[PDB]
Amino acid sequence: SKLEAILSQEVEAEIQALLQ
Amino acid sequence: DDFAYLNARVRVRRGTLLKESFFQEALDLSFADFLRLLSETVYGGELAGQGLPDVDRAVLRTQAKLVGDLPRLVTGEAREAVRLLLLRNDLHNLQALLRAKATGRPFEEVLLLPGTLREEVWRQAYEAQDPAGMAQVLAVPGHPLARALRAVLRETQDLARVEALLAKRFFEDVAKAAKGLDQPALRDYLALEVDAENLRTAFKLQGSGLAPDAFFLKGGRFVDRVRFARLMEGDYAVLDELSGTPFSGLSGVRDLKALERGLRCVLLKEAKKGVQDPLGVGLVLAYVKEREWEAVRLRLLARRAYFGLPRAQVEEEVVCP
Amino acid sequence: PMEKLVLAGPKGRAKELLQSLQQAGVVHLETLRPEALSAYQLSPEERAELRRWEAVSAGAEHTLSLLGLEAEPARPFPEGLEAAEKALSPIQAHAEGLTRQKQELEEELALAQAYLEPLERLAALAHGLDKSPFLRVIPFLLTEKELPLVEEALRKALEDRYLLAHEAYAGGVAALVVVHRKEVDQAKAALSRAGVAELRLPGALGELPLSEAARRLKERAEAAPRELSEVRQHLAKLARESASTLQSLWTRAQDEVARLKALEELASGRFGFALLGYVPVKAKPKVEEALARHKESVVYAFEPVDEHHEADRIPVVLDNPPWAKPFELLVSFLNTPKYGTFDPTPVVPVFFPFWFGMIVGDIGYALLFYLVGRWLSGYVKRNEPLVIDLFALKLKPQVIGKLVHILNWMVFWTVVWGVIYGEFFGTFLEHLGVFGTPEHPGLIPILIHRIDTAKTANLLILLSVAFGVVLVFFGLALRAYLGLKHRHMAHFWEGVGYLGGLVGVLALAASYLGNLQAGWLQGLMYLGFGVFLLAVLMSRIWLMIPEIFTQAGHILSHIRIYAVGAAGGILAGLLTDVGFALAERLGLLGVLLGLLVAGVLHLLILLLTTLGHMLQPIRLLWVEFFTKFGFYEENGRPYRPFKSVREAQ
Amino acid sequence: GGLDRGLIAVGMGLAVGLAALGTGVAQARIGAAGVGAIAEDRSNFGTALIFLLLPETLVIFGLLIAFILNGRL
Amino acid sequence: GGLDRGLIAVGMGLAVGLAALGTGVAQARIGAAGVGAIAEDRSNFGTALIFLLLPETLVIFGLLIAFILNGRL
Amino acid sequence: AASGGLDRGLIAVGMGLAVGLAALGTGVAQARIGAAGVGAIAEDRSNFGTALIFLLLPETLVIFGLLIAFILNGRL
Amino acid sequence: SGGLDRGLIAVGMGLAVGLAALGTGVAQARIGAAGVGAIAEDRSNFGTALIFLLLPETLVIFGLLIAFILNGRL
Amino acid sequence: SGGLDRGLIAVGMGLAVGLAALGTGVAQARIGAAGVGAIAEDRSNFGTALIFLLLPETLVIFGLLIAFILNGRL
Amino acid sequence: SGGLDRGLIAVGMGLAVGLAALGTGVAQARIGAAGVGAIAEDRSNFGTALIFLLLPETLVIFGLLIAFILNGRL
Amino acid sequence: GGLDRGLIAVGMGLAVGLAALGTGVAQARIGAAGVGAIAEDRSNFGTALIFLLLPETLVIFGLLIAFILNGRL
Amino acid sequence: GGLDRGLIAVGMGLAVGLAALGTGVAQARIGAAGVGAIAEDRSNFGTALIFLLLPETLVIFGLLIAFILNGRL
Amino acid sequence: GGLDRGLIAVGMGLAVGLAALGTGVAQARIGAAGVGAIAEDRSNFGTALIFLLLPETLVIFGLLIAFILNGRL
Amino acid sequence: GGLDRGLIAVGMGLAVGLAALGTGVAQARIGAAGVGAIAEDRSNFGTALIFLLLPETLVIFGLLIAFILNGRL
Amino acid sequence: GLDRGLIAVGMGLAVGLAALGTGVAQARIGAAGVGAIAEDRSNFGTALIFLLLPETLVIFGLLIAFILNGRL
Amino acid sequence: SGGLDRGLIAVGMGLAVGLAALGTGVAQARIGAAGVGAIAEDRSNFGTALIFLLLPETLVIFGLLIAFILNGRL
Amino acid sequence: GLIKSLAEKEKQLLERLEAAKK
């Protein structure tokens, strides 16, 4: 849902941290 | 309910009111003996210092203990009238608070009035950062004015207009509830009140950001669209043009502060007119109005004593003719 | 009554002796100085000392207030003025800091209570811990207009990068935006475009983690009253441990300030002095000896009594023999009568307890009223104050003594009227072989049977109305006597007109029900109404015509003296009847049960209606009687005389 | 006959009762405003009692008519 | 007499009692405003007693009627 | 079993009902009237005239009630 | 006998005029309250206050009318 | 015999007209009170004040109608 | 037999119509009070105030209905 | 013997009139609050008319009993 | 006889009528409050209906008694 | 006869009942303002009882009449 | 001889009824202010409860009259 | 017998007056409750309770009504 | 008239309990208003409000006492 | 409050896995 979409848009930052 | 009960408590608290001799007595006095004088009265009970900050903290604490209870003391139908009667000057307190946060004057200076919110809540409101924060902190104790301030903030975001628009919407809601109640003296008082608010907001604009009818509000009795639109310009002699109604008593044009003084005086007088109806609302009306005038006089006299300001300028203020 | 207070307007010479004269008088006796021909107050040092003394006095009052205790005169404080101020300011400032702490903590607990529940709900919905770089800002919007406004604002801000936490609460909703790493900057702008910012906290925790800060606020609220209660009892100990010096200083300061404010009027006149004074004759020798012995001032000057010149400036203090003094309570609070005009302190004892007797019965309640009298007399024997939560009753022994004498009068007249009524119908129905009983065919008490409403009715109510006639006539005649003394033609003619019209309508009733003797009555009624009309004419106030009806109402109003009595008496009678009835329905166990329940119902009806009983005859004296001869019209200057308070040592 | 006396009784009871109700409706407002004024100023006690028992005359005269009928049997 | 006297009693009772009730309902508000006046301005006691006493004429007239009925008894 | 028994007695009850109910009316009226007046006059005796006029005017109700009563007594 | 008739019509007239006077009374009460109020400040309109106080008089007028009709039949 | 035929009808007449008078009394009462209030607040409302004051007389009129009908019953 | 009959019938008639009038009176009282208030606020409430005020008239209409309904029994 | 029809009609009148003022007081307070709401905002008209016409069922029940009684005749 | 036949109607009509008066004053206050809340916000129309329909039980019991009597007639 | 003893009961009952109702009405507002002043200031409990126990005399007059009538039995 | 029992019954019924009505009229305002006071204070319990229980004197008198009426039945 | 009519008047007075009592009670009680609800929903829980307490009145009315009706 | 005797006894008992319940209702009106207000201020004072709500029930208890005293006769 | 419940449940595991993995 919209909550999961916002959670993915936020976890994009965690993915970027893990890629860093 | 049972106005007779609220009226009994009001008539008890009216006995500890400060007689008229006290004002002229403390008019010419030193701050130590002034503090003494305040120690003898009822306000002594919460006076815990010798400096002006503690004096005014005591004054506000006692006005709150002694007036800000009247809602909570009654329920049902009379609670509505008394909640109106306090919410008016609660609006006015928030209005002055907004104007203060505009000019950055410290919260300790902004004059507060006896309202249903305690002292510390307004302390927070000014200690809050931006007007939206004020709305939120006012919504914390569930204030029927918080949501109004919020809904008006989302439109203007300018303190010159938002205060008067807030007044308009609040008077709409609360004059609605009042007309629902249908009490004679209360309705006449609401009339005088909305009229006074109009005559002040007229003086507060003076040509800038003009809106000769977007800032008006219905429900009045003695001022009207035409005289309001006049005072929407820079004219000043529009007052004695209104010669019949009590607002002819102002009979002058000095300054926004002196205009507000005259309006406070005439409204206090017309409330004093409402004593001769014990089993009703006129009594508690007159008592709350006299109590807020008492607080304002204590302010304008502790100010003068502490700063040693000359006796003349405040003597001009004490009489309320 | 007035005991004819008389002007003692002396005239000392030495201005430097005035402080001496007043330091004498205040410890000596009572004079109640007026403000006659006043002049200045010797400004340089006298104004200063007055200021400091009133300051320390009201300071004592203020710190007594904050300490909880009330003002009380205990003992002077002779240690000095500088020492007085330097022994007050420490204790007053200590207690002032104390109450500062207490009220600050009250405010703190208030704020914590106000902030708790919304913050608690937020924390409950603060599943996402507020440590993370992507943030959780806290709004507090309402319910109805909440959703669309903030939703559109956040959509204009970003595209569903935000997350909302909606939960119902006492407020509208506990709205909560979940914000990304750097989105908070623009999200504040977006919500301000919607009209909301983040809900800032009291400030000492507006920056901590909200979850932790929630527990912090909870803990403060859970500990604040404990801290508040401990600082309260701390203040209480501070109060108790020094209150002696407080009241002592207060006494000394009140003496000094009364002395100085008196001097302010005293340093007057066109010569080196001027003074007037009011002392009762029954104290004049005492004030004279007190002036002569210590002072023997340059000279004094005594004046006459000037029965009426202004009639206001003269004070009054009701005196009376202890044959009737305790009753002074029962007339004091209504008014203080002006000098000259009559004083009704002596009339109350003649009637009030007698009427009360006429209301209740001896075996009925005189026994238990004397038990209460014994209780209160022991209470005054130990000389203790009365402390009862029913109100701020501080019944000092000088009040309990008066009360026990009053109750003694009341109970004696009740003893009298009891056997005249033969009360406790029960005890009479049970056994009184001395006089005709209900169990007897011929039921007759000693004189009259109030339990028999058929035979004794008209007699008893005629007796009550006779009390009315005699008392009201005394009232009107006294009004006329005072109109003669005070030389007010209106007063006199109005009084005699009410008297005449009232006796006229009385004889009218007599004829209308009792008899017919023309010259005895018809002529009497005619001439009564004629003198009434003569009065309304040569008085021209003409409010008689409205009030004359009220005056007949008043004279009749004494029917209640019998009415309340009949009600209560035969109530007790029928209750005793029910008691013996239940005793007869069953055996001796039934007898015990019935006596118990009858006693219980009697105690209930007693503690209920006894106040109305005590209150009727006294209100007959209060409004039926006093209103006529004039007792609420003027009010003489009450006796507030110059004196060291010292509880009148 | 008995009907006579019975109607006498009901009429006189009605008289005293209605007059009592009149004094009641009066004293309600009266004593309310009274105790009010008293609580602020213990001196206001006098006129408070004057006015609380000025309309006692109504039930007094109702009771007078009651007594007239009573004596009339 | 007969039933006539009987009922006549109820006539008198209605007259006097409802008159007293009229006075009482008029004594309530008038006297309360009077207590309100006297509680703040001593000098209005006189001009308040007149207002508090005037509506007593209602029970005066009801009493006139209650008596005239007694005449026809 | 008197002839004019029910006759005279109901004339009585009618007289009493008339006067008493008219009294109730006058009382209810003068209640509000004086409740406004007594307050009014405490501002200026130049308001006492009209205040007393308004107080006395509704007494015409009891005037009419007593007139009806007199008519009924005449029929008796 | 005719006593029942001649008396019941009497109590009818009484009740009629009485309840009519009661109606007029309550109406005059409410009306004259604001009447006195609006005269109090300047007595600018005695006319409208008096007129509104007088309008409800029709009630007791009609009560008297019914009573007159009945007594005429008496 | 014609005992109370003519009489109870009269009691009905009186009761009807009187209770109708009460209805109009209460209605006209509150109405006129607020109406005098408005008139004091502004003179321009004499019309509407009169309209609302005079609408509720239908009640006493219908009471009079029932009364006259019962009179017709004689 | 018929006298008391008709008499009572009239009593029922009067009581019905009268307390119907009373209901309409109370209703119209409060309603028209709030009405004339709103009218003093502006004209635009004239229609709603009137349609509110004239609405409870159904009460006295039902009263006159039941009156006429029992009228045939005379 | 017209006692039957008589008392039946008077019971009918009593029921219908009592129910009349029953719905009357309800519509009174309700219409006060309603017309207030309408003067506030025009868009509550039907929401008000519902509550104004909801108590009608009371006088409906009154007339129901009236019809049930007259039918007995 | 016929008198008791009609008095049954008197009683049942009085029962329904006073029940109607009761529920009428109840609905008066309830509908006042409910219209207030509704005009404030629409979110309480349902609870307004529930509270306003609750006092109908009074007139329902009234009609119940009325029918209990109608069985006797 | 019989109706003598019959209607004497309605007489006394109406008397005591109406007088008690009068005292209740007079006592309601008085005691209300009484407990008001009390809770606001404990000091004047005495005034509250004084003004509370004065209007209880009307029911006393009522009992006087009721008992005088009971004397006739 | 028999009807008298019924009139005595209606007498005592009316007596207790009206007396309890008056007592309730008092209780209404008294306890309303009582709850208003006890709302924020807990010490006012002992005084508001006295003021509530005191007006029961009226219904006690009603019970008195009713029982003494029964005494003959 | 003939009493049945007066028995009906009795029960009618009983149920109807008790009904008027509950009417006034629920009137004030709900007029306060409904207003209270506009601030929270626990007001619903308590206000229903306090609306049903006056039901005791009409319940006692019907009680006495059936009691006497057994005799009818 | 033993029939009419029992009938008046029923009128008595019913009127008694009815008026007693009326009084308890009138009292319980203000009591409930105040209690609901108090609860709306705090969920703790219910323990006292309810104590007052059920305090004037003694009036109906007395009404029922007298109703039963009259019952036992029927 | 279904939106709030779902959002809290999601963000919980989201932040958990974030702080765990990186």
Numbering used by the authors:
A (entry chain L): 2 to 21
B (entry chain M): 3 to 323
C (entry chain N): 4 to 652
D (entry chain Z), E (entry chain O), J (entry chain T), K (entry chain U), L (entry chain Y), M (entry chain X): 8 to 80
F (entry chain P): 5 to 80
G (entry chain Q), H (entry chain R), I (entry chain S), O (entry chain W): 7 to 80
N (entry chain V): 9 to 80
P (entry chain K): 21 to 42
According to the publication:
The V/A-ATPase from a thermophilic bacterium, Thermus thermophilus (Tth V/A-ATPase) is a rotary ATPase that has been well characterized using both structure and single molecular observation studies. The Tth V1 moiety is composed of four subunits with a stoichiometry of A3B3D1F1 and it is responsible for ATP synthesis or hydrolysis. The Tth Vo moiety, responsible for proton translocation across the membrane, contains a central rotor complex (d1c12) and stator apparatus made up of the a subunit and two EG peripheral stalks (a1E2G2). In the holo Tth V/A-ATPase, pmf drives rotation of the d1c12 rotor complex relative to the surrounding stator, resulting in rotation of the entire central rotor complex (D1F1d1c12) and inducing sequential conformation changes in the A3B3 catalytic hexamer to produce three ATP molecules from ADP and inorganic phosphates per one rotation.
Here, we report a cryoEM structure of isolated Tth Vo at 3.9 Å resolution. The Vo structure reveals that the asol region and d subunit adopt distinct conformation, appropriate for inhibiting rotation of d1c12 relative to the stator a subunit. This conformation is different from that seen in the Vo moiety of the complete Tth V/A-ATPase. The final map shows clear density for protein components of Vo, including subunit a, subunit d and the c12 ring, but the EM density for both EG stalks, which attach to the asol region, is weak indicating disorder or flexibility in these regions. In contrast to the Vo structure in the holo complex, the asol region in the isolated Vo is located in close proximity to the d subunit as a result of kinking and twisting of the coiled coil at residues a/L119 and a/A246 (indicated by the arrows). At the proximal site, three amino acid residues, a/E57, a/H65, and a/Q106, form salt bridges or hydrogen bonds with residues d/R38, d/S41, and d/R63 of the d subunit, respectively. The two hydrophilic channels are separated by a salt bridge formed between c(Z)/63Glu, a residue critical for proton translocation, and a/Arg563, a/Arg622, a/Gln619 of MH7. In the isolated Vo domain, the d subunit adopts the closed form in which three side chains of the d subunit are able to interact with the distal subdomain of asol. The isolated Vo domain displays no proton conductance when the membrane potential is lower than 120 mV, defining a voltage threshold. Our structure of the isolated Vo domain further reveals the mechanism of mechanical inhibition of rotation of the dc12 rotor complex due to strong interactions between asol and the d subunit, regions unique to V-ATPases.
